[PDB]
């Protein structure tokens, strides 16, 4: 059982719209720190909301009595910023949060100390060629590198060390972490880079994918998100067409190249943002099924379901406007997309207790053997024009 350690109202800084919003936060003893539109009455807790292993800053700009939770989540540094009315309030909160976090590190260390089983056994920047900037965030950059000794290509995420201070995933369509090392002032993650090209480029050249082509890519995405949701208890919150690449054989790869940009331009890409993220509401696994819907609409229709060059009007489209479909789209596709793009997460396909299973049973995916998807036994509809892992057809 997870009991409430401290609860109350905070002003949460907004990333997309209203900048400062009052929210009712519960800090629980499992480490979750979650804000709601209103104080709630009564799913599985998401690690996205954990304060475990966070660092806590007090600050006075741009508002007095603000404080910051900074966490490293897998390979991404994220910052949550809050404001209270009195400095005494801020000390109650930072102290409660630290106490919950410390108690979590404590019981954890005692448990692994007790269970270590002759796992008590005791790479540098020079080893790599910089090739090309892939992204810059507030606390790091992501670069395409060539590992000198092997000639292989990787993305390297380079983080500022002082904002932070074997666990990989067995899913074939996620970005695997190859090495992790540190320098005197940096933490570097070396992760795989697919050389079958960017799906945004493939879609742009083909104009549209057939429903069957989109079915193949969507299935692989569904299987990766299911894995994240139910094995890792994390939501991705970053699904967009540009974060999908193909490997040398035509199988999907979801990239892990994102960096938060708060404090350097939105963080993500606005046209893929789910309504509950825009409004800074309580969100859960269902934000990813919204992202799946935007990506598959784009795949099957050749364009976005919501677009406007003015991001203020795009947000309004995302929040208010009902979705329209090209006249050629079939009804199973339409059923899938409008279920994925329900504005209310509570109504959204995948937004119920069953999560991915709701999508895997949708008649648009009928006939898919989900075990063969996970084992890469489905035959790719498109084989990219590379015949080696070190082939640079799709960068040069």
């Amino acid at each position: 059982d997870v009991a409430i350690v401290k609860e109350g109202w905070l002003h949460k800084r907004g990333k997309y719209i209203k900048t400062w919003r009052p929210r009712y936060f519960l800090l629980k003893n499992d480490g979750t720190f979650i804000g709601y539109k209103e104080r709630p009455q009564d799913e599985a807790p998401l690690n996205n909301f954990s304060v475990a292993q966070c660092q806590l800053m007090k600050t006075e700009r741009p508002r007095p009595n603000t404080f910051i939770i900074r966490c490293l989540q897998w390979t991404t540094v994220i910052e949550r910023t809050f404001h209270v009315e009195t400095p005494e309030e801020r000390e109650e909160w930072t102290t409660a949060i630290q106490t919950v976090a410390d108690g979590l590190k404590k019981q954890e260390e005692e448990e692994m100390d007790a269970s270590a089983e002759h796992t008590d056994m005791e790479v540098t920047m020079n080893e790599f060629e910089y090739l090309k900037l892939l992204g810059k965030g507030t606390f790091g950059k992501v670069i395409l590198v060539k590992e000198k000794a092997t000639g292989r290509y990787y993305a390297m995420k380079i983080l500022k060390k002082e904002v932070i201070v074997l666990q990989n995933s067995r899913h074939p369509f996620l970005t695997a972490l190859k090495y992790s090392f540190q320098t005197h002032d940096r933490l570097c993650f070396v992760m795989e880079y697919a050389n079958g090209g960017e799906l945004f480029f493939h879609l742009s050249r083909e104009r549209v994918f057939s429903e069957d082509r989109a079915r193949f890519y969507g299935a692989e995405i569904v299987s990766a998100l299911d894995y994240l949701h139910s094995e890792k208890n994390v939501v991705y919150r970053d699904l967009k067409l540009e974060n999908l690449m193909l490997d040398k054989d035509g199988h999907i790869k979801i990239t892990d190249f994102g960096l938060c940009k708060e404090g350097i331009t939105f963080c993500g890409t606005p046209e893929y943002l789910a309504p509950e993220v825009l409004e800074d509401n309580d969100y859960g696994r269902a934000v990813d099924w919204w992202g799946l819907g935007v990506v598959m609409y784009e795949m099957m229709c050749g364009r976005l379901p919501f677009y406007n060059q003015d991001h203020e009007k795009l947000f309004e489209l995302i929040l208010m406007e009902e979705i329209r479909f090209p006249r050629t789209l079939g009804p199973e596709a339409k059923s899938l997309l409008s279920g994925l793009l329900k504005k209310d997460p509570k109504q959204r396909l995948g937004g119920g207790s069953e999560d991915a299973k709701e999508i895997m049973q949708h008649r648009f995916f009928a006939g898919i053997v989900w075990q063969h998807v996970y084992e890469k036994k489905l035959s790719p509809p498109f084989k990219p024009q590379v015949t080696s892992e070190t082939d640079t057809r799709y960068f040069d």
Partner: nanobody, 116 residues
């Protein structure tokens, strides 16, 4: 404070024996896998021996049959009995917990020197 302290090192002739002890204050050795390590003037630090909470022991090869690791719950201390010493054993010796090991926290260590 919160720390491990090694003692029992010194100069000793080849084939001889030495008993190293690691005294824990602020740490309970009953609750933690314990291990002994050593590091020589130019080389990597070497896992030597570990004892789980169950009492089961394990040894790296160049030491098996000559050293024995033991933990005495009463005096909150681990031991490393070192027998039939070879000058290839000359090093500074450290005991540690898993948690401290991953954080690279080390006690002062004790120097063992064997030559003849």
């Amino acid at each position: 404070q919160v720390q491990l302290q090694e003692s029992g090192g010194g100069l000793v002739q080849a084939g001889g024996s030495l008993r190293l002890s690691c005294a824990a204050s602020g740490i309970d050795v009953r609750i933690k896998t314990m291990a002994w390590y050593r590091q020589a003037p130019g080389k990597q630090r070497e896992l030597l021996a570990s004892v789980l909470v169950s009492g089961s022991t394990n040894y790296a090869d160049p030491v098996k049959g000559r050293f024995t690791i033991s933990r005495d719950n009463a005096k909150n201390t681990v031991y490393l009995q070192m027998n039939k010493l070879i000058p290839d054993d000359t090093a500074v010796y450290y005991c540690n917990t898993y948690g401290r090991l991953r954080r690279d926290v080390w006690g002062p260590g004790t120097q063992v020197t064997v030559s003849s």
